[PDB]
């Protein structure tokens, strides 16, 4: 259905360590396909997915060029930032920027992304209208005015509705079996006694893609939040994701609990119960 392409930039100044470090990563949905590290032994755009690895040399040369350009841009923005917040050059700071596009079902731009934060806090972000900007503080308003003066939202929007979507479609075509694939989660319920009166029920969902998934517990068919623990969705390391949800249950009440898991790859929602 809906797909997306996102780029994540992280620039960290290193007073004394010389130039700031720039790290860029590219994602199609939940699949990383490219990377760039200024601290790599030979800085260049690298393939992290099989379906982008066979792109001609021009792709990698241009990609590298743009990556380095972005790096320098973030350096200049780091200096400008030091000057906006009146900070010392002996201190370390961070600039993060995520930007991308969401290809909808009708092959048209569904949503656009262009947001940047300074030192882990919102700095300036492109609004849903794709016309206006939102500045977090008085320092970001300078940038906002600068970008309003040079029609940046318009131009970047031209990028969004054009090149971005084009390349996204190209990737989706070349990586058909991988990107347009929806792997269902291999699930199972485990039992772990805490004492002689209580026992933990843990619902496992493994090796699923994409990362989006819903996992809950129900007592007597009623939603349960009390005495429950859900861990953050974690990567498997092979391109898949994992997640489990546990609940503390009185001994003898086990068969009254059910784990519910919904995922894109699931033909039908799952209703699981402890199967000793």
């Amino acid at each position: 259905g809906s797909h997306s392409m996102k780029y994540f930039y992280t620039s960290v100044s290193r007073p004394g360590r010389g130039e700031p470090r720039f790290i860029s990563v590219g994602y199609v949905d939940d699949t990383q396909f490219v990377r760039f590290d200024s601290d790599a032994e030979s800085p260049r755009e690298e393939p992290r997915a099989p379906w982008v690895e066979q792109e001609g040399p021009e792709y990698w040369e241009e990609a590298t060029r743009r990556a380095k350009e972005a790096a320098q841009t973030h350096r200049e923005n780091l200096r400008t930032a030091l000057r906006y917040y009146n900070q010392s050059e002996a201190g370390s700071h961070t600039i993060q920027k995520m930007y991308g596009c969401d290809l909808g079902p009708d092959g048209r731009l569904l949503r656009g992304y262009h947001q940047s934060a300074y030192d882990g806090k919102d700095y300036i972000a492109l609004n849903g209208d794709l016309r206006s900007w939102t500045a977090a503080d008085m320092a970001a308003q300078n940038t906002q005015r600068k970008w309003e003066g040079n029609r940046y939202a318009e131009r970047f929007r031209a990028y969004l509705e054009g090149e971005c979507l084009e390349w996204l479609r190209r990737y989706l075509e070349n990586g058909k079996e991988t990107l347009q694939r929806a792997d269902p989660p291999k699930t199972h319920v485990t039992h772990h006694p805490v004492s002689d009166h209580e026992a933990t029920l843990r619902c496992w969902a493994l090796g699923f893609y994409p990362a989006e998934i819903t996992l809950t517990w129900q007592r007597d068919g009623e939603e349960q939040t009390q005495d429950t623990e859900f861990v953050e969705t974690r990567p498997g390391g092979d391109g898949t994701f994992q997640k489990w949800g546990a609940v503390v249950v009185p001994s003898g009440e086990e068969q009254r609990y059910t784990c519910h898991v919904q995922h894109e790859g699931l033909p039908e929602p799952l209703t699981l119960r402890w199967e000793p």
């Binding site: 780029y7 755009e45 923005n77 400008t80 131009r155």
Partner: peptide, 9 residues
């Protein structure tokens, strides 16, 4: 692909 252009704060 990546975006090209000047983006100064």
């Amino acid at each position: 692909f990546q975006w090209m252009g000047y983006e100064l704060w």
